[PDB]
Ligand binder design. Structure first.
Ligand SMILES: *[C@@H]1O[C@H](CO)[C@@H](O[C@@H]2O[C@H](CO)[C@@H](O[C@@H]3O[C@H](CO[C@H]4O[C@H](CO[C@H]5O[C@H](CO)[C@@H](O)[C@H](O)[C@@H]5O[C@H]5O[C@H](CO)[C@@H](O)[C@H](O)[C@@H]5O)[C@@H](O)[C@H](O[C@H]5O[C@H](CO)[C@@H](O)[C@H](O)[C@@H]5O)[C@@H]4O)[C@@H](O)[C@H](O[C@H]4O[C@H](CO)[C@@H](O)[C@H](O)[C@@H]4O[C@H]4O[C@H](CO)[C@@H](O)[C@H](O)[C@@H]4O[C@H]4O[C@H](CO)[C@@H](O)[C@H](O)[C@@H]4O)[C@@H]3O)[C@H](O)[C@H]2NC(C)=O)[C@H](O)[C@H]1NC(C)=O
Ligand SMILES: *[C@@H]1O[C@H](CO)[C@@H](O[C@@H]2O[C@H](CO)[C@@H](O[C@@H]3O[C@H](CO[C@H]4O[C@H](CO[C@H]5O[C@H](CO)[C@@H](O)[C@H](O)[C@@H]5O[C@H]5O[C@H](CO)[C@@H](O)[C@H](O)[C@@H]5O)[C@@H](O)[C@H](O[C@H]5O[C@H](CO)[C@@H](O)[C@H](O)[C@@H]5O)[C@@H]4O)[C@@H](O)[C@H](O[C@H]4O[C@H](CO)[C@@H](O)[C@H](O)[C@@H]4O[C@H]4O[C@H](CO)[C@@H](O)[C@H](O)[C@@H]4O[C@H]4O[C@H](CO)[C@@H](O)[C@H](O)[C@@H]4O)[C@@H]3O)[C@H](O)[C@H]2NC(C)=O)[C@H](O)[C@H]1NC(C)=O
Ligand SMILES: *[C@@H]1O[C@H](CO)[C@@H](O[C@@H]2O[C@H](CO)[C@@H](O[C@@H]3O[C@H](CO[C@H]4O[C@H](CO)[C@@H](O)[C@H](O[C@H]5O[C@H](CO)[C@@H](O)[C@H](O)[C@@H]5O)[C@@H]4O)[C@@H](O)[C@H](O[C@H]4O[C@H](CO)[C@@H](O)[C@H](O)[C@@H]4O[C@@H]4O[C@H](CO)[C@@H](O)[C@H](O)[C@@H]4O)[C@@H]3O)[C@H](O)[C@H]2NC(C)=O)[C@H](O)[C@H]1NC(C)=O
Ligand SMILES: *[C@@H]1O[C@H](CO)[C@@H](O[C@@H]2O[C@H](CO)[C@@H](O[C@@H]3O[C@H](CO[C@H]4O[C@H](CO)[C@@H](O)[C@H](O[C@H]5O[C@H](CO)[C@@H](O)[C@H](O)[C@@H]5O)[C@@H]4O)[C@@H](O)[C@H](O[C@H]4O[C@H](CO)[C@@H](O)[C@H](O)[C@@H]4O[C@@H]4O[C@H](CO)[C@@H](O)[C@H](O)[C@@H]4O)[C@@H]3O)[C@H](O)[C@H]2NC(C)=O)[C@H](O)[C@H]1NC(C)=O
Ligand SMILES: OC[C@H]1O[C@@](CO)(OC[C@@]2(OC[C@@]3(O[C@H]4O[C@H](CO)[C@@H](O)[C@H](O)[C@H]4O)O[C@H](CO)[C@@H](O)[C@@H]3O)O[C@H](CO)[C@@H](O)[C@@H]2O)[C@@H](O)[C@@H]1O
Ligand SMILES: OC[C@H]1O[C@@](CO)(OC[C@@]2(OC[C@@]3(O[C@H]4O[C@H](CO)[C@@H](O)[C@H](O)[C@H]4O)O[C@H](CO)[C@@H](O)[C@@H]3O)O[C@H](CO)[C@@H](O)[C@@H]2O)[C@@H](O)[C@@H]1O
Ligand SMILES: *[C@@H]1O[C@H](CO)[C@@H](O)[C@H](O)[C@H]1NC(C)=O
Ligand SMILES: *[C@@H]1O[C@H](CO)[C@@H](O)[C@H](O)[C@H]1NC(C)=O
Ligand SMILES: *[C@@H]1O[C@H](CO)[C@@H](O)[C@H](O)[C@H]1NC(C)=O
Ligand SMILES: *[C@@H]1O[C@H](CO)[C@@H](O)[C@H](O)[C@H]1NC(C)=O
Ligand SMILES: *[C@@H]1O[C@H](CO)[C@@H](O)[C@H](O)[C@H]1NC(C)=O
Ligand SMILES: *[C@@H]1O[C@H](CO)[C@@H](O)[C@H](O)[C@H]1NC(C)=O
Ligand SMILES: *[C@@H]1O[C@H](CO)[C@@H](O)[C@H](O)[C@H]1NC(C)=O
Ligand SMILES: *[C@@H]1O[C@H](CO)[C@@H](O)[C@H](O)[C@H]1NC(C)=O
Ligand SMILES: *[C@@H]1O[C@H](CO)[C@@H](O)[C@H](O)[C@H]1NC(C)=O
Ligand SMILES: *[C@@H]1O[C@H](CO)[C@@H](O)[C@H](O)[C@H]1NC(C)=O
Lengths: 624, 624
């Protein structure tokens, strides 16, 4: 096997384990030291202000199995340090009959057992497990563990009656799934339920949702309430919080609700960030975020969605979250978004970006799979003075509209997402920053125009504001990871409202995915404006391309160019003329970003192992 | 609930957990501190000469489950000390996907991994498990662990390819079972296989049997050989060592071979004890000991058997053990005999005595279930100058006969069993010993004649030699645990050759078993003798009654009299007359025996617990 990146790639399947470890690997984001990772889990801000991040982990393997919590910490979301204990960077692992099949996703009770941070997680045991299988009660249960050393280790409650698992009875029959407990406090829900606590006897200050669905009848998010404040064993099922139909879609801007929910969370936001009011803040909005499965033909059958909801109290002392509008958290190769509270009235969200090697052709050669997204502040995005002639504005798809008294302008409300400012500041400050001159794209514009300053490697950020005419048919955007022979094109086409990532030339290596990514972006036209603007920011980090538009739309994807010089970037233009012009301004290149794992050497592989012939006998894990 | 043992028992099912802990509990033998125990395991003589004894254990429960190795040690087989570590008296427990369903029986490689004592044990995982179920490959595998601290703790090899489990492929299809690996060295088998090692490539100095069978086609003992000396991962299947038919019986003296073997072992003995010759000792005999299941209507469907075998070498480099004669290791409520080598050319055997509460009526009230038998030296019993007119002598059922040159006398050979002398010496020396006058049982004999000295509690031993006429129809024996209203009768009836334990009056508590126990005993008549003699020794230890006849026949059973004064003992006589007389001599009572667990308080209960509703969901363990 040749690793010569100045010539065409050979047959890379002949290369040894982890021989391509550094070739495509992100350096500026959260990623496991090696091996398989998936969903973020156990996220919390520790007492010292640092962030604890857990993740679903299978060290020394490149497929899922024996799933455990790997963990690390950071003071700024950006520069991280691994925990190191008796199980390396793992801090929770399968060890008991109730969780031996996997320590699945879980979330944090900050003041839990004996006052310590406490995780409620899905403990899995034997049997068919999956939304398309005939799962039985007991295969997925919910269990507790607590930490006396700020996440270096966790102590599980004992197995048995009145101990672990703490939630095991299915709340309804024929579930498609029963996992991913999300624990949260909610002055809002407490106020809504306060007149019904005699019906249920549940008066605790923590709520928990469990994600699932019902066979043949769509997804469900089940709401539990802690029975008594300061006691963590008894959780009382109230009722279904979110109920959607079998492969129901709210429309083109909203993905598809599939057959089963995963990793669902509940939050309340206002324009500044997290809102902890009881309903009295008229600017605050209740949101649910959730993954759905089997409602999508590609992207591992997974949609990471969100919905704004209006809560209604049922007669039996439960809550119906009625969906008001519904959107997409990320349109690309990401899933399993977890959100958590951060000091200063913030709610921060992070997800998992999977690879684009679904046939597992070069996974062993990588020696790892997966990374996180960047950490994102959630908030209510409010756009004032929106023109009523904005096309499709009153579909109110993934946004709400409020007319002015005179009917001449509209206020638009939707979910806002932006990269946490700590990361943007660290990235910019550690990079070589080039502030680029504005560019008018007209009849003289080439299809591709390289920036006047170029990246030096596969670790950079780009930003720009693209000003379009209101009736434009021109397209513009950014080309990244570019040489003559390999490149990835990020286009926005205002006439169709489509942001695309064209990957037909992303790599000479043909086994990686090359399908076109697509997001919908609504340019809310402002009253009196004779143009409409797209603010586009792109992070390039090894193989990750993570795109943000207007602090609203996110699209994560993957590109794996072979050639060492496929690092360039610049502007894309199509159909720009003397009359149909695209003005690009606020252009900036940040070359280098940050080394996110300063204590790690370049190659943190420990090799790969095979579980042997028993893996197929047990039938639980691939074994590699 | 009343614990008044001076009046009739009330409804004892109303009593709390462990309220009857001391009432019926053995004090002079190996028993767990509390809870459930079954099979002995991991038996070995440590480097300091002490004995390490493991056992199948489920603390704080009174039914089987989460099965683990509990352990203790002794310098003399008699006075024991518990290990105490992070898991109390447990030293191996379910902890990995491959053994999470139970750490089943295993045996010791004394010089194993890195020179340390090493256990090869059955590691169980999920799925139907049992001889009457449809078990699949992987549910029972065989795994290694080693100890660096003389049995205080064990370190398992890692899970995976080339590590644990080390034996997982079924050697034949449709097995009824695949467990209880018995590792042993054998100069005999090495010599027999030495000319065939090119066929198999297996040249190690350790052999291992695995116990099982084939659906519809009887039991099997599978023989493996360590592939290479000093290496413990690779074990090569040679072939079936013992093959018996579906519920085949060798006859009235031999139990029934059932459908599946459990806890099988292989040894070689001579008249003095263990034999380590290569075949050159003409006095040595090869033996297999084994449990069988589903060949018996009662006694938990279990026979603990043994067979003398003659080894034949197969063309494919394996061994057929052809059964020469076949007997019973214990005729009562015991099973799961394990044997192990002890210094001074000894092979020592010990089994598990279960309770007689098969409907689980008072198990919670006990707070424990099970004990060991006494430890027994195995040897070849040889009886010289046997008269050819001994009835049924040439059936050669569970013995062999060799005629003298002149045909006027016979040498009889069979398996000998006797209590280890360390235990007999300690028992006698710590007891109040009464040497009783000989008694002729004739026309004046009462049905029951109390001994001139009486026991003071339920912990004593009796011995006597009963001399019968060659054509007697009289019966005699011992009554034990006796008051006016409760008693247990041990009879021998030479005319039928039956040793019985009649338990119709054993207890006023009606929920315990009351069926009559039965053993066959052959009194080998000596040339020139005008009488035949039964040497009968009985140990009474709480509820255990353990009977030995002629250092050959063993019968363990249970009696649970309620009354505090049901402790007496004496002679039984039936049909003795002026002409048909039974002479009893060598009579001795040992009152008190030994406190086998001197560091333990009287009540070592830690209470009982319930696993909760998930026990029924997982379906593996009762949960209590
Ligand atoms: C099948 O069998 C399995 C094996 O038996 C079984 O698993 C075992 O289950 C039991 C029962 O649930 C578990 O026991 C619990 O353990 C908890 C602690 O767990 C952590 O620590 C242990 C032991 O720690 C040591 O040993 C290891 C090994 O050598 C070392 O690594 C450590 O350094 C440490 O060593 C020191 O201590 C040793 C002696 O113990 C010394 O020898 C040594 O020199 C050192 O000094 C670890 O083994 C655990 O690891 C395992 O589990 C983790 C996950 O948790 C895994 O990641 C890991 O891989 C291992 O599998 C773990 O790290 C105990 O806290 C717990 O005791 C509490 O609960 C019980 C009730 O259940 C009470 O009786 C008890 O009193 C305790 O409750 C009190 O305290 C807590 C807080 O401390 C309070 O919340 C509570 O309210 C209560 O308060 C009381 O006291 C207060 C203070 O005084 C007072 O204020 C209050 O008022 C009140 O009175 C319990 O002992 C055991 O860990 C499992 N073991 C394993 C290996 O899994 C399995 O379940 C069975 N399966 C089935 C299906 O049945
Ligand atoms: C799902 O995930 C699970 C979790 O990841 C996974 O289970 C884990 O599997 C791994 C991999 O198999 C296991 O790792 C092995 O561990 C062996 C030791 O195991 C014992 O000790 C550990 C750790 O001990 C400490 O930590 C605990 C907890 O705090 C304390 O209680 C102890 O006191 C002790 O603490 C000290 O050390 C800590 C740091 O480690 C310090 O922080 C602390 O301050 C103290 O100083 C225990 O956790 C184990 O307990 C568990 O298992 C037991 C049963 O074994 C249970 O009863 C218990 O409940 C727990 O479950 C246990 O007690 C290692 O020996 C082993 O490493 C050897 O093998 C690997 C290859 O596999 C080699 O890479 C490595 O080099 C070692 O091999 C060398 O050494 C041996 C002899 O020592 C030689 O035989 C060998 O040939 C080789 O020799 C080499 O070195 C020689 C010397 O230099 C040289 O001469 C030679 O030439 C040669 O070079 C390995 O690390 C891990 O234990 C499992 N953990 C658990 C919790 O189960 C599970 O499998 C996964 N499942 C699936 C389906 O995938
Ligand atoms: C003495 O020791 C015991 C341990 O053995 C210990 O714990 C008790 O253990 C017994 C079992 O021995 C448990 O009994 C079972 O209880 C089930 C119902 O339990 C519910 O109601 C109870 C009564 O109010 C509550 O106490 C329970 O609370 C505990 O558990 C919950 C979790 O559910 C936990 O949140 C709490 O904190 C408590 O820990 C609980 O709410 C019964 O379903 C079960 O019934 C079986 O057994 C009966 C008697 O044999 C039958 O009548 C039933 O039909 C059924 O048995 C059948 O058996 C067949 C054959 O196997 C099978 O095929 C059928 O399907 C069926 O199962 C049983 O009665 C008891 O709950 C438990 N108590 C606890 C934990 O508090 C004691 O605490 C200990 N005492 C002391 C003082 O220490
Ligand atoms: C690089 O990293 C790997 C870990 O990923 C590590 O270990 C190797 O891992 C691979 C899997 O990635 C193993 O491959 C499998 O091997 C099976 C046969 O193995 C036997 O032959 C080998 C070749 O001589 C031996 O090396 C093996 O020895 C080891 O294992 C034994 C225990 O059996 C142990 O005693 C020894 O000590 C060694 O540890 C062993 O004797 C194959 O059956 C298996 O085949 C599957 O995959 C193929 C390729 O995809 C297909 O062609 C097959 O059809 C089959 O896949 C199918 O998949 C579908 C879909 O899932 C399924 O439905 C079908 O049923 C079917 O399964 C596979 O090839 C490899 O054995 C293992 N090597 C080891 C442990 O040494 C490497 O060591 C590491 N390299 C380095 C240098 O570190
Ligand atoms: O680690 C468990 C936690 O992860 C979640 C959230 O993702 O559950 C994920 C889940 O499967 C993930 C898995 O499967 C996906 O990809 C497959 C191949 O394209 C596709 O067929 C599946 O429909 C899709 O779910 O991802 C990897 C491959 O990327 C694959 O090996 C995994 O199965 O994990 C559970 C058990 O595998 C599944 O039920 C579940 O969908 C969260 O819900 C869990 O807590
Ligand atoms: O601990 C596992 C090791 O023990 C052995 C040797 O005994 O396997 C025993 C075994 O079952 C023991 C068990 O069942 C017996 O009693 C039942 C009730 O009378 C009867 O129906 C069964 O046929 C008989 O096997 O004993 C207790 C009750 O005394 C009961 O709970 C147990 O099942 O353990 C395995 C799993 O339970 C069985 O497959 C096996 O027969 C040894 O072979 C194991 O290493
Ligand atoms: C990039 O590398 C390729 C292969 O070495 C080469 O053909 C090309 O000219 C290089 N330079 C570029 C794209 O500027
Ligand atoms: C409360 O009512 C809802 C709507 O009928 C139902 O789905 C839920 O199961 C009920 N909650 C209970 C029974 O706890
Ligand atoms: C909102 O404004 C638009 C444009 O003026 C108008 O068509 C629509 O009827 C208004 N809606 C309401 C509720 O007044
Ligand atoms: C570089 O990044 C580090 C780690 O995130 C950060 O702490 C530091 O402030 C950055 N340097 C700058 C902004 O000069
Ligand atoms: C824009 O995207 C939609 C999917 O939402 C698709 O149907 C349509 O064809 C696209 N149009 C163009 C011009 O890209
Ligand atoms: C034994 O105890 C019972 C009940 O207290 C009593 O009736 C009997 O007389 C006692 N004495 C004996 C058997 O010698
Ligand atoms: C050796 O021969 C015997 C008798 O045919 C057979 O049962 C056994 O499986 C053979 N051993 C092998 C194939 O290893
Ligand atoms: C053994 O001795 C008996 C009695 O003398 C005789 O009947 C029998 O035939 C003898 N057997 C042999 C093999 O000589
Ligand atoms: C009493 O028993 C102990 C423990 O088995 C033993 O060591 C001691 O020798 C015995 N006492 C005698 C024989 O006097
Ligand atoms: C002796 O035991 C056998 C069972 O081996 C039985 O068939 C026979 O009836 C018994 N006879 C007497 C008199 O007890």
């Amino acid at each position: 096997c040749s690793l010569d990146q100045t010539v065409a790639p050979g047959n890379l399947t002949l290369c040894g384990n982890a021989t391509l470890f550094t070739t495509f690997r992100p350096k500026a984001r959260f990623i496991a030291p090696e091996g398989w990772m998936n969903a973020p889990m156990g996220l919390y801000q520790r007492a010292d202000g640092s962030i604890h991040a857990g993740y679903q982990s299978h060290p020394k393997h490149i497929q899922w199995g024996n799933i455990s919590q790997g963990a690390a910490y950071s003071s700024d979301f950006t520069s991280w340090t691994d925990f190191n204990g008796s199980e390396g960077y793992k801090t929770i692992w399968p060890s008991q009959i109730y969780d031996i099949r996997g320590v699945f996703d879980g979330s944090i009770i900050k003041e839990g057992i004996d006052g310590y941070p406490t995780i409620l997680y899905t403990s899995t045991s034997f049997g068919p497990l999956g939304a398309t299988l005939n799962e039985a009660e007991g295969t997925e249960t919910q269990s507790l563990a607590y930490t006396t050393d700020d996440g270096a280790s966790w102590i599980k409650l004992g197995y048995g009656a009145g101990q672990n698992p703490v939630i095991y009875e299915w709340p309804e029959t024929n579930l498609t799934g029963f996992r991913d407990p999300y624990v949260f406090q909610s002055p809002r829900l407490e106020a809504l339920l306060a007149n019904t606590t005699s019906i249920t006897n549940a008066t605790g200050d923590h709520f928990a949702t469990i994600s699932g669905g019902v066979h043949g009848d769509g997804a469900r998010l089940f709401l539990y309430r802690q029975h008594t404040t300061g006691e963590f064993i008894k959780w009382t099922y109230l009722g279904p919080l979110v109920t959607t139909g079998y492969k129901e879609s709210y429309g083109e801007w909203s993905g598809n609700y599939g057959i089963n929910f995963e990793t669902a969370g509940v939050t309340r936001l206002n324009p500044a960030g997290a809102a902890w009011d009881n309903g009295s803040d008229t600017t605050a909005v209740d949101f649910v975020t959730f993954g759905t499965e089997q409602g999508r033909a590609d992207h591992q059958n997974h949609w990471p969605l969100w919905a704004a909801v209006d809560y209604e109290v049922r007669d039996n002392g439960s809550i119906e979250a009625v969906i008001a509008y519904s959107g997409v958290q990320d349109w690309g190769r990401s899933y399993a978004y977890a959100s958590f509270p951060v000091e200063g009235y913030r709610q921060v969200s992070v997800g998992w970006i999977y690879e684009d090697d679904d046939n597992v052709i070069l996974a062993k050669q990588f020696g790892y799979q997966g990374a996180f997204t960047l950490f994102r502040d959630l908030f209510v995005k409010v756009v004032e003075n929106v023109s009523p002639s904005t096309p499709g504005l009153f579909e109110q798809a993934s946004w709400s509209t409020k007319n002015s008294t005179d009917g001449m302008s509209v206020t638009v409300t939707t979910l806002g997402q932006r990269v946490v400012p700590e990361t943007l500041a660290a990235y910019k400050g550690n990079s070589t920053v080039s502030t680029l001159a504005p560019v008018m794209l007209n009849e003289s514009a080439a299809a591709y125009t390289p920036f006047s300053s170029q990246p030096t490697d596969r670790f950079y950020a780009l930003t720009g504001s693209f000003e379009f005419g209101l009736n434009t048919t021109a397209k513009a955007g950014f080309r990244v990871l570019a040489s003559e022979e390999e490149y990835t094109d990020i286009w926005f086409d205002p006439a169709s409202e489509n942001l695309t990532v064209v990957r037909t030339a992303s790599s000479l290596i043909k086994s990686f995915g090359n399908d076109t990514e697509l997001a919908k972006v609504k340019l809310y036209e402002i009253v009196g404006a004779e143009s409409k603007t797209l603010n586009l920011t792109v992070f390039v980090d090894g193989s990750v391309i993570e795109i943000y538009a207007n602090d609203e739309v996110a699209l994560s994807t993957r590109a794996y160019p072979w050639l060492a010089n496929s690092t360039g970037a610049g502007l894309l233009a199509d159909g720009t003329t003397a009359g149909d012009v695209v003005g690009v301004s606020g252009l900036e290149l940040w070359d280098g970003l940050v080394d996110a794992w300063p204590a790690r050497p370049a190659n943190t592989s420990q090799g790969l192992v095979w579980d042997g012939p028993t893996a197929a006998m047990y039938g639980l894990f691939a074994g590699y």
